[PDB]
Design a protein around this ligand. Structure first.
Ligand SMILES: Nc1ncnc2c1ncn2[C@@H]1O[C@H](COP(=O)(O)OP(=O)(O)OP(=O)(O)O)[C@@H](O)[C@H]1O
Ligand SMILES: Nc1ncnc2c1ncn2[C@@H]1O[C@H](COP(=O)(O)OP(=O)(O)O)[C@@H](O)[C@H]1O
Ligand SMILES: Nc1ncnc2c1ncn2[C@@H]1O[C@H](COP(=O)(O)OP(=O)(O)O)[C@@H](O)[C@H]1O
Ligand code: VO4
Ligand SMILES: [Mg+2]
Ligand SMILES: [Mg+2]
Ligand SMILES: [Mg+2]
Lengths: 480, 471, 471
């Protein structure tokens, strides 16, 4: 009855309700329609408000009354949500019943800052050899995994997440990791493919998954990441740590412009509303490192991105790589070659530096990634040498054979001390000379051979946490 | 139910501009998506409501011509979206974008009709079960495998082998299929729809006598407005839906170009009061392609093994049209135009033809390895073919492919109208021995193009005789 | 002074749309550029006035979030632009885009504050005196020389070595610098700002105890709105200003990306009521980049030796962003992405790295000649590397470079976190003998990459031993 606290829709279409009244609406407080539907107020104007509707229009129509929910767009969060799947507004969908939470959390928070943060230390294990060893991911940071269609971005992240297994039930609480998987755009079957699959490895038991799958109106595919950020922020603000994956921010880019153009906010580049930066800066900047003096907690984020034929410098990618610290590039161009994960060095970095890689990798991996940084020339030459520096062949013999050790691949992660097992053997050229081909069986058998008799050598990394003078010899004996 | 308020469900047309008719009701505003009936007509003109402009005026999208329409004509409110008759009583018949019968065989007597706009199946409805389904085609069946309920996607750059392939998949798959089938022809030629009709008669599939028909034909093409090409894909989907759900069966659905579902918006967007985007397009293409494709799926009640087709405007995969689509198709096949020169047919490319069903568990460890190995050799092959050696081969480094490229160039059935070459196929059967040889080296030496327009290794020596070289 | 008229300097917010808040005052319209105080707040929200729309309504640009703002909230008129406290009493502290303390160490007690919008130094204020200043870096110090008050510009294509370099210039230059220093971090990571903080503690530069601090840290980054990234560069400049002028000293200023001063407009332009331009941008980018950079200069009262950084959107120097900027920087360094593959680091390129201080009078006749000669050999080198010979070298025409390319690839200090390589530097000292040899032929023959990730000729033979070749 009063346009003070309510208002009748003046127009609607394409999910942009030009509501009348709502004089007291705040600038972002989500609201309520007559068909019982949310939408938040985005364009507060002199004679209307322009609300963006969550979900398909149909029921929304000229006159529908709108009500106030005086609370900036906030979403549920807490421990309860662990082990479930919800849309991207909080509410569950895995039919597993309700998760009546009692600790909300808004999504428009501003990233901490200089003083709350400290230093990326206490790395996080993907379990993916090639990843960690080469590209080690530290905790509290943003690692960008760009990569074209069919290339492994979701699997790697899915392995990286599967790796926390043994951790989420063992001793050292601090040596754990909770997981938040954000699905943006994807077919809701691909999502059920993961929920079920992660459930197979019990992995879902310590994970939270959120979906903004195609059907869902553009705002949802938008608000989704900002919903997952908050999920983990529960941990990053409670000592506990977390791993969030924003599967396709790219698709969220495709999905953001939509919403803004319909509010008549002048487009700029490829329709992208200008604040396509503040779109993805604002978000990533929220996964930070927490200082003891503030909590010690953390949140690591790997934003997924869609590579258009190989271009990593497209607007949005620049927009995203220009932020994130460390970007793992996945190239479809390689893959089938067997070169999987297929990471391009020279166009992908860890950025945070050797702080992530523990002394172990700082011992072995120290040569691995930049041996290949300029090797991208020689491995891009040898194909035609003949009369050069006769023995320059070593820096070459060292890409091929190793490469076949550098090609992790399976639905299984090889813990840090196993990763300290097989690759090390190469960096310390012993397998070396031997024509590659069978190398695959070393990395395979060296373990079934290790967990069958060598149960102490791995134990010297849970004691000394590096390579022993001793086990150097020991390993060096089973390898030779 | 379709029944309005105790106040006039009639509006009077206030604006006409090609495919957009604005209408103004006084006593009963019709929701978005509602099918409207234009009075004063000599036919059936339905205008789908699209927006609620205010000033008690809606905004519709014309389902057929807006010819002769007049500023004041009465428009009726049905009170429900465009609903087409769904049922077994639509099999063997041809419907149009509204359910009107266009195969001329009179009324489509049916128990009910379903709205063409229905809520897509929820999360707790989906099904992880990915049981395989064989086509017996080279790249298409082997390389990028297919599956039950899985979506097929053929990316063609305008006349590269997208629709030919589909008739073909009808050949091996449709006929032998148990369960019902559908074919929504969206956008594309009327010529084909006709032939496709009569071919489906010649081969019984559609029988005009008994009641032994399995396919259902929904059409809405080129000679029509975009409001029509916008929804024909929906209708031919609303069909396949009813069969899977309310009649628990594993259906098949054939969409001849499913992104016409978007040319549509690209022809109605701006003229609706919207701000353009990528290429001009629409700030909705994502949700569009989305909301639609998320219906053609399986569920706890039945499965829909579908086959679509997606066009490549200006030959640019860089179009957010073929592009955006990818994320939906459970197997890729980007037929290349630079490939048709090479004659390689289908023009499926040894790069951009993915699948979310190509793991050793379902395809084969042996098979998926040489696939990796076929595209492997192929990758450095794509480079070598020009890089290093500079076109002319020979050079040095003897360190197969040209062979395998001819292997997966199965000229098959639907391509007979060109050179008598026929149904080159057979379900995996003797791929073994054959293709593996090429790669490891075995049997690989036969004078190059001597093994070109054929597949099975058995025809290397069964042709060497045809074209012999010795003395 | 900041005092309004005898009529209300309070307006009421009439429109909010993201970063743009329109406000309406009745008894005292606030000029463009005035800092406005939003009442009803739980923090400090300042809206910088931008236009005088008429109907007695202004148009502001939000300096922080516009969350929860309400159509009617009172907005106060300060009566003067955003003014930050300037003084020695800001050294060792961290300020934000308004002067608020963000390093948490409490109030910034200062004698006065200066407006962040000040008239740039006039013509009869400028100074022709270009006294040299050494950095001891290969390309950067030698090739494209630097200077006192001179502007440095690092053009990076997103992760090519723009910010790493700056920390480095801090290393050799900042620490050893006599006089005060500043660091405005505009746009870029908060991660870095943090580390940069603590590193400046670890190395005393910023000491939290005594009062032996020389740098001043002004920040406004990524997790903030564009109104903020628009002016943080200004503030960290308003700082360096006060030191040079009112306190006669030769300051240094470090802007981590200064064109963020333009992403800003690119995020506020159109939403302000403007017609787009180049790439969408703004019809102001020129005057923008202009009006701002024309403050960071020397004068008859003091000097500001600054170091900026300019990003290359979509890797296109063809962007009117890196482009337009060039005309300001007293030495260029376009780090190339196709160079990082080559590992060459810094990625400074043997072409696009100019300077308006590279004449024999100040750099050297000997030095500027072999520089001409280094890029000379390099030019026909860029051609030969592909042209004529076609990739593979050898060919014919023996008529050094690959050598010199390794010379100027000094891996230095700030790149230790990658492969232990350390502070490769030293101020000109032994460039003599060394680099000249390469070009005339002398000492030039050492087995190619055998002299790669190092610089001094003395390490050709001090490595030949490392990797030997003979018998
Ligand atoms: N280690 C592995 N080696 C070879 N293939 C793998 C491996 N792990 C997963 N795969 C297969 O690789 C593909 C992994 O990438 P996936 O398709 O899931 O994600 P993506 O390409 O990044 O994004 P999208 O799902 O949109 O294609 C899957 O099709 C999967 O079956
Ligand atoms: N299997 C095939 N073998 C040989 N040529 C083919 C084959 N399929 C298509 N073509 C060639 O390409 C043209 C276009 O193919 P078509 O399948 O009709 O594509 P679409 O209808 O999707 O544009 C045909 O006219 C024919 O010359
Ligand atoms: N001096 C250097 N030596 C070797 N690699 C470098 C050097 N400077 C930068 N890099 C490489 O390039 C990446 C991007 O450089 P960075 O300086 O952080 O640029 P920006 O911060 O300006 O984007 C780093 O992660 C590193 O791999
Ligand atoms: O990495 V930089 O996007 O800031 O050029
Ligand atoms: Mg994916
Ligand atoms: Mg066709
Ligand atoms: Mg930077």
């Amino acid at each position: 009855v009063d346009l003070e606290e309510t208002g009748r829709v003046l127009s609607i279409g394409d999910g942009i309700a030009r509501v009348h009244g709502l004089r007291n609406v705040q600038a972002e407080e989500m609201v309520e329609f007559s068909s019982g539907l949310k939408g938040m107020s985005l364009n507060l104007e002199p004679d209307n408000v322009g609300v963006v509707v969550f979900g398909n229009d149909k029921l929304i129509k000229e006159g529908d009354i709108v009500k106030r929910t005086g609370a900036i767009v906030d979403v549920p969060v807490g421990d309860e949500l662990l082990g479930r799947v919800v849309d991207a507004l909080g509410n569950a969908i895995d039919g597993k019943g309700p998760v009546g939470s009692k600790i909300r959390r808004r999504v428009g928070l501003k990233a901490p800052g200089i003083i709350p943060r400290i230093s990326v230390r206490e790395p996080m294990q993907t379990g993916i050899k090639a990843v960690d060893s080469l590209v080690p991911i530290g905790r509290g940071q943003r690692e960008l995994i760009i990569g074209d269609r069919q290339t492994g971005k979701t699997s790697i992240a899915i392995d990286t997440i599967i790796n926390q297994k043994r951790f989420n039930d063992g001793t050292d609480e601090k040596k754990k990791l909770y997981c938040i998987y954000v699905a943006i755009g994807q077919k809701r079957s691909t999502v059920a493919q993961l929920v079920k699959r992660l459930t197979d490895a019990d992995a879902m038991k310590y994970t939270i998954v959120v979906s903004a799958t195609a059907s869902d109106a553009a705002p949802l595919q938008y608000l989704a990441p900002y919903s997952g950020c908050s999920m983990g922020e529960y941990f990053r603000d409670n000592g506990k740590h977390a791993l969030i994956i924003y599967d396709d921010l790219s698709k969220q880019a495709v999905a953001y412009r939509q919403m803004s153009l319909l509010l008549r906010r002048p487009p700029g580049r490829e329709a992208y509303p200008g604040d396509v930066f503040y779109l993805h800066s604002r978000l990533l900047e929220r996964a930070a490192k927490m200082n003891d003096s503030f909590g010690g907690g953390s949140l690591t984020a790997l934003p997924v991105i869609e590579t258009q034929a190989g271009d990593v410098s497209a607007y949005i990618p620049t927009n995203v790589i220009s932020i994130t610290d460390g970007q793992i590039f996945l190239e479809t161009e390689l893959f089938y070659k067997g070169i999987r994960p297929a990471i391009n060095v020279g166009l992908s970095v860890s950025r945070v530096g050797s702080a992530a890689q523990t002394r172990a990798m700082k011992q072995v991996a120290g040569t691995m990634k930049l041996e290949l940084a300029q090797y991208r020339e020689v491995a891009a030459f040898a194909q035609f040498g003949s009369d050069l520096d006769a023995a320059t062949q070593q820096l070459l013999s060292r890409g091929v054979r190793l490469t076949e050790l550098l090609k992790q691949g399976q639905y299984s992660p090889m813990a840090i001390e196993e990763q300290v097992a097989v690759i090390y053997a190469g960096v310390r050229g012993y397998l070396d000379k031997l024509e590659p081909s069978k190398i695959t069986k070393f990395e395979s058998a060296f373990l079934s051979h290790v967990v069958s008799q060598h149960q102490s050598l791995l134990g010297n990394i849970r004691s000394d946490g590096k390579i022993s003078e001793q086990s150097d010899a020991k390993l060096k004996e089973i390898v030779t | 139910s379709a029944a309005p308020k105790a106040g006039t469900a009639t509006g009077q047309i206030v604006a006409v501009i090609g495919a957009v008719v604005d209408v103004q009701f006084d006593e009963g505003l019709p929701p978005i998506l509602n099918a409207l009936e234009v009075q004063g007509r000599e036919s059936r003109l339905v205008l789908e409501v699209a927006q609620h402009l205010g000033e008690s005026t809606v905004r519709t999208i014309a389902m057929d011509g807006t010819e002769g329409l007049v500023r004041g004509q009465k428009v009726l409110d049905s009170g429900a979206p465009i609903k087409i008759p769904v049922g077994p009583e639509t099999l063997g018949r041809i419907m149009n974008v509204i359910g009107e019968p266009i195969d001329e065989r009179g009324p489509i007597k049916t128990k009910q009709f379903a709205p063409i706009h229905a809520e897509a199946p929820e999360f707790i409805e989906m099904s992880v079960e990915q049981e395989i389904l064989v086509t017996g085609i080279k790249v298409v069946d082997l390389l990028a495998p297919y599956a039950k309920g899985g979506k097929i996607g053929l990316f063609g750059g305008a006349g590269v082998g997208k629709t030919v392939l589909i008739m073909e998949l009808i050949n091996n798959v449709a006929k032998a299929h148990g369960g019902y089938s559908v074919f929504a022809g969206v956008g594309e030629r009327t010529r084909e729809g006709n032939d496709l009709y009569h071919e489906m008669i010649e081969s019984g599939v559609i029988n005009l006598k008994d009641a032994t028909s399995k396919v259902a034909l929904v059409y809405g093409q080129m000679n029509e407005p975009p409001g029509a090409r916008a929804r024909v894909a929906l209708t031919g989907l609303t069909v396949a839906e009813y069969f899977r759900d309310q009649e628990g069966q594993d259906v098949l659905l054939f969409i001849d170009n499913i992104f016409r579902f978007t040319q549509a918006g690209s022809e109605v967007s701006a003229l609706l009061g919207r701000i353009p985007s990528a290429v001009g397009y629409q700030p909705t293409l994502a949700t569009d392609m989305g909301t639609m494709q998320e219906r053609i799926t399986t569920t706890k009640k039945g499965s829909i093994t579908s086959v679509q087709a997606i066009y490549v405007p200006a030959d640019d995969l860089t179009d957010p049209a073929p592009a955006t689509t990818f994320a939906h198709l459970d197997a890729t096949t980007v037929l290349s135009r630079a490939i048709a020169e090479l004659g390689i047919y289908p023009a499926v490319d040894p790069l951009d033809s993915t699948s979310r069903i190509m793991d050793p568990n379902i395809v084969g460890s042996e098979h998926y390895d040489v696939a990796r190995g076929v595209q492997k050799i192929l990758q450095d092959y794509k480079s070598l073919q020009d890089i290093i050696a500079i076109l002319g081969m020979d050079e040095l480094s003897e360190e197969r492919a040209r062979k395998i490229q001819r292997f997966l160039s199965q000229p098959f059935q639907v391509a007979e109208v060109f050179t008598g070459h026929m149904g080159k196929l057979v379900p995996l059967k003797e791929t073994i021995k054959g293709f593996q040889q090429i790669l490891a080296g075995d049997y690989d030496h036969l004078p190059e193009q001597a093994f070109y327009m054929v597949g099975p290794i058995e025809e290397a020596v069964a042709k060497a005789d045809k074209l012999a070289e010795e003395h």
